């Protein structure tokens, strides 16, 4: 799944 900046703390 493509990395999305900030999706770890802040969701897709």
């Amino acid at each position, epitope marked *: 799944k493509p990395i999305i*900046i900030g999706s770890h703390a802040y969701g897709d």
Partner: antibody
Amino acid sequence: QVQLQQPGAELVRPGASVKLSCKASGYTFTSYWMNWVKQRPGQGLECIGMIHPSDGETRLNQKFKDKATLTLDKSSSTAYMQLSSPTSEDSAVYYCTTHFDYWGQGTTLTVSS
Amino acid sequence: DIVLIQSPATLSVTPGDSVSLSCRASQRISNNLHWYQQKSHESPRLLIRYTSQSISGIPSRFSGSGSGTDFTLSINSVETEDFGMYFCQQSNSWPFTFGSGTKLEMKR
């Protein structure tokens, strides 16, 4: 909460390989990418590459193709970056970060004899 | 490979004044532009993601805007905790690359 833990400082002699560690806690280690980032003293930030612990998928900045190797100890939720034949040009702060939101505190690497 | 230019490298501002910082990309990057704050002795901290999306916990005085090639981070009413380095980063094309950074220092 999520923690990414890196030793503050590492000292390597020129030519000797060094392997930096990033230990992840507080979340599912296989659920997010792990990035490594280099920062020289007064200078900017360079992405070295990233690895996904689910399947080991990895994308490398080709500037570092012959310098950095990314690996994982899934059992301990630890990510590693190995720097081969270090030189004074590799002296820098090295950060791990998952999706550029949670950051380790960075390892200061010094290459010196 | 994509080059981001942050100009000028240093800005001086008095607390309470407003500021905007500039980031210009060597090629079009859609909305794939993020902003980071980095204080002395600290790792960077994501402030704005995808050009203008706010980050939970970041003061509402921070906002971002931009169009494909030219981007700005605005701070209305700089506060003492805002002084530090600001970087932009593009994630349109691998390798992801950062600008060289603009230091915000306190005018006195």
